[PDB]
Each structure stands twice: as structure tokens, then as C-alpha cells.
Amino acid sequence: GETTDGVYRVMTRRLLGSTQVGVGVMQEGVFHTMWHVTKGAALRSGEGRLDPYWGDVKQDLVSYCGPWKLDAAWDGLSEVQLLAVPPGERAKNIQTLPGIFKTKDGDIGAVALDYPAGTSGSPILDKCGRVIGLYGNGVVIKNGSYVSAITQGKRE
Amino acid sequence: DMYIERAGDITWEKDAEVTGNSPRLDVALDESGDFSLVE
Numbered sequence: 717g718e719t720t721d722g723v724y725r726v727m728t729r730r731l732l733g734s735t736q737v738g739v740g741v742m743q744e745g746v747f748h749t750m751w752h753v754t755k756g757a758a759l760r761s762g763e764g765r766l767d768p769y770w771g772d773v774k775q776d777l778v779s780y781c782g783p784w785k786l787d788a789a790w791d792g793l794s795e796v797q798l799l800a801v802p803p804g805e806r807a808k809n810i811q812t813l814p815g816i817f818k819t820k821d822g823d824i825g826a827v828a829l830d831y832p833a834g835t836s837g838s839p840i841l842d843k844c845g846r847v848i849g850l851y852g853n854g855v856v857i858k859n860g861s862y863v864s865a866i867t868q869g870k871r872e
Numbered sequence: 873d874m875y876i877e878r879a880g881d882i883t884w885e886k887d888a889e890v891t892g893n894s895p896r897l898d899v900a901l902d903e904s905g906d907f908s909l910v911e
């Protein structure tokens with residue numbers, strides 16, 4: 717199937733009509749998305765099949781066709797862009813200054829932008845266009861709004 | 873059954889709409905990969 721680098725919608729025809737369950741990144745022949753989007757199931761790309769290669773429920777990440785390739789990190793200072801790919805809507809870049817998720821195991825960037833659940837897996841970019849993480853796993857704060865972690869894998 | 877559809881190139885857009893705040897939150901991450909607020 718199509719292996720061109722880019723952002724892709726993750727769709728299903730099991731429910732009513734065609735439904736977008738999430739988004740992902742094709743880079744260096746590997747498809748990267750969040751574990752909760754596919755639950756590790758195989759994907760179809762045209763007539764081709766993409767088999768899972770690596771996954772982890774705690775990181776909430778999964779790669780297909782090869783090992784995780786995305787290794788860019790947020791610098792802790794600069795604004796970033798969410799390349800939001802919402803269901804039924806065109807890809808749209810939204811620029812923001814990330815906040816921080818402080819944990820017992822270290823700090824990670826966080827983006828305070830609200831999108832439908834089917835947007836999970838949309839990439840977060842630095843000024844060079846490099847993918848510093850995926851948007852789509854986070855928390856609901858006091859007022860009811862959504863704050864996502866900047867989830868990044870490890871390049872072995 | 874799941875399938876993928878291309879949606880675009882991965883590029884930074886000069887003059888994109890700037891929005892969202894930068895909250896600093898104490899959070900916990902459990903074995904099921906679920907985040908929670910620490911208070």
C-alpha cells in the first residue's frame with residue numbers, strides 16, 4: 717500500500733458508516749500511532765497489510781512494519797504545533813506553548829488543546845517539522861477541558 | 873477491520889493560529905497507561 721511519509725487517518729468500517737478512531741505518522745517505512753487507537757490489531761493500507769512490530773500499553777504507543785523511529789524531543793522552551801487531523805475535517809496546524817505534566821519519574825511536555833477522541837495520534841511538531849511526540853493520551857482538569865501529554869517513544 | 877488513509881504532509885505552518893494555555897500539573901501514570909491528576 718501507500719508508504720509515503722506523512723500523517724494518516726486510522727479508520728474502521730465495523731461501526732455505522734466509516735468511522736475515524738485515530739491518527740498516525742508514517743516515517744521511514746514505519747507507521748506510528750497510540751496503542752489505544754488500534755489495540756495492537758493489524759491495519760490495512762489499500763490492498764496491503766501492516767503488522768504490529770512493537771507496542772507498549774503503559775507508554776500507549778505502537779509501531780507497524782518496523783521499530784519506533786521518532787526521536788525528536790521538545791526543548792522545554794519553544795512553541796510547538798499540533799498537526800490536528802480531526803474526524804471528517806482537514807488537517808490543521810495549531811501553534812501552542814506546552815505546559816508540563818510533573819510525575820514521580822520526571823517531567824514531560826503537555827498540550828492544552830481540545831479535540832474529538834478520534835484525533836488521538838495526531839503529531840506534535842517542532843519548528844524544524846520534526847515529530848516530537850503524539851497528541852492523544854492525557855487528563856481532564858478541574859474545569860472539564862482536556863490536556864494531552866506530548867507522548868514520545870524511544871528509537872532503539 | 874482497520875485501514876489507513878493519507879491526510880497530509882508533516883510540516884510547520886508559518887502564521888498558524890496560536891491558541892491554548894500552558895498548565896503545570898502533578899500527574900500519575902498507571903500500568904494501563906492511564907494518566908490521573910495527583911492532589
Ligand SMILES: CCOC(=O)c1ncoc1CNC(=O)[C@H](Nc1ccc2c(c1)CNC2)c1cc(Cl)cc(C2CC2)c1
Pocket residue numbers: 752776831832833834835836851852853854855856862904905906
Ligand atoms: C474514558 C473516561 O474519560 C477519561 O478518562 C478521559 N476523558 C478525557 O480524557 C480522558 C483520558 N483518556 C484519554 O486521553 C483518551 N484516550 C484514551 C483511551 C483509552 C486509553 C488511553 C487513552 C490510554 N490508556 C487506554 C482521549 C483522547 C482524546 Cl483526544 C479525547 C478523549 C475524549 C473521549 C474523552 C479521550
